[PDB]
A = this chain, B = another copy of it.
Amino acid sequence: MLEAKFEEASLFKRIIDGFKDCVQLVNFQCKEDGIIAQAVDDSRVLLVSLEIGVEAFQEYRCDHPVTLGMDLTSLSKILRCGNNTDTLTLIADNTPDSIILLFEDTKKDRIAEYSLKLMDIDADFLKIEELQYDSTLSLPSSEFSKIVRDLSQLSDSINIMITKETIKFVADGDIGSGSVIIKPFVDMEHPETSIKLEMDQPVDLTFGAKYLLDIIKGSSLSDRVGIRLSSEAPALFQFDLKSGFLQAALAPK
């Protein structure tokens, strides 16, 4: 039986919106260790993954490894149905055909219960990460998101080129071309605005615009974003959070 209780429902809503437009119909898996999720879009180019630890809740309980597939559009349609200041509780049992979400106010004057009919999803999972990549950077999520949104207006292709102490974003389309160049710096005044880069091998990889625009929707989850790039493996974007992370994998071109 699954009895999870978030401290606040806002976290779960933001997490769902972090890859809502990325992939739909994600098959979560709940264990006694935490909640994970892995999904691939219809085009099979983006691999989105979720990990939520026990510490992200004020009270978590589980006694059966359950697998729960549901529609992200309908799930987000339900997640907006609770007063944001209330507390959210996920409820499921052994071999279920629906998941139940309980919204409770502090003094229990109102109680909202929503039942969501599940979906039959093929239980397939993918593990492709390694310990080190050709280059590894970390930059503020808002800055990276604005960079992507700026370059998406020019073309449907965004190139990233990383050399020693140099990160470059190129985009060439019909109306013209654009280039954003950032350099690593460990600023003492503000550590969060600092861009960090570890350089092992130069990188020059082209990605799509739509997939990055959907990826950057996890900007509300973290202040920073960590990108791992290698010539052989897919680019790895990662947003960290309180005992958990969202991890997108995008194949270059």
Contacts and interface: CB of A to CB of B under 8 A. Distances in A.
A191 interface: no
Contacts of A117: 175-176
Contact of A153 (B81, B153, B185, B195): B81
A129 interface: no
A178 B114 contact: yes
Contacts of A80: 150, 153
Interface stretch (A87-95, A104-112, A238-246): A104-112
B110 A181 contact: yes
Contact of A111 (B116, B146, B175, B181): B181
Interface of A: 71, 74, 77-78, 80-83, 98, 109-117, 143, 146, 150-151, 153, 175-183, 185, 195
Nearest to A143: B110
A115 to B, nearest CB: 5
27 contacts: A71-B175, A74-B176, A78-B153, A80-B153, A81-B150, A81-B151, A81-B153, A81-B178, A83-B146, A109-B183, A110-B180, A110-B182, A110-B183, A111-B180, A111-B181, A112-B150, A112-B180, A112-B181, A113-B178, A113-B179, A114-B176, A114-B177, A114-B178, A114-B179, A116-B175, A116-B176, A117-B175
